[PDB]
Amino acid sequence: PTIGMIVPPAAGLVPADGARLYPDLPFIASGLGLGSVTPEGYDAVIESVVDHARRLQKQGAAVVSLMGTSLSFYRGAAFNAALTVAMREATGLPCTTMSTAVLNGLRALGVRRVALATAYIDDVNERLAAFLAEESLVPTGCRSLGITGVEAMARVDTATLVDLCVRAFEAAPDSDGILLSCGGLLTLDAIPEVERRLGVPVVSSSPAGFWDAVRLAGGGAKARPGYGRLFD
């Protein structure tokens, strides 16, 4: 089944990880045009998520994921759930979000005490931690990049991301795992290196969003190897 993805940037590209994780699977995307990775930014596009779900349905999507973590968690857990229900009611399709994806990935891996490694500014990190606590997880600490640019996220390099994860875990080495939050980041090369060095799993926004969307679509598809414990 074709999987549809609502993505933050105006360009509306399928996130790059899809072709690496699931080379044989069909994805399509629709772009919100988020202006900044901030609550003010989210407010300016959040009301269009339903319209974009419908746009994807009209292009043949069989399931829809809102592929933005912060767009889906910034208002708390009930809003993530309610927005999902609205997308489902509007489209008659199975729907999900990237916040649900990371929650499901952390749960699947048995992660309860979770170190946060994020691209975001602290107001957004506080909202992430509150969302996770609402959902019965225990954030242990946070290290972040403080970036508000949307398209800027793709240019953060692997070494920076590996270091970010290692520093977040260093602060709380009792953590069961690491949440690497921001679906605009290119994290696939960082993940196995972090897992190798630290011996705990990483749940990363974009890869988790794919893993979750592929689960929702129901084919049983298996990802290519080398992308982290979440994928086997």
Swiss-Prot record:
The keyword Transcription does not apply. It catalyses: 2-aryl-2-methylmalonate + H(+) = 2-arylpropionate + CO2. Its EC number is 4.1.1.76. The keyword Lyase applies. One of its GO terms (molecular function) is arylmalonate decarboxylase activity. InterPro entries: Iso_Racemase_Enz_sf, MaiA/AMDase, RibuloseP-bd_barrel. Gene3D superfamilies: 3.40.50.12500. Keywords: Decarboxylase, Lyase. PANTHER family: BLR3294 PROTEIN. This is Arylmalonate decarboxylase. It comes from Bordetella bronchiseptica.
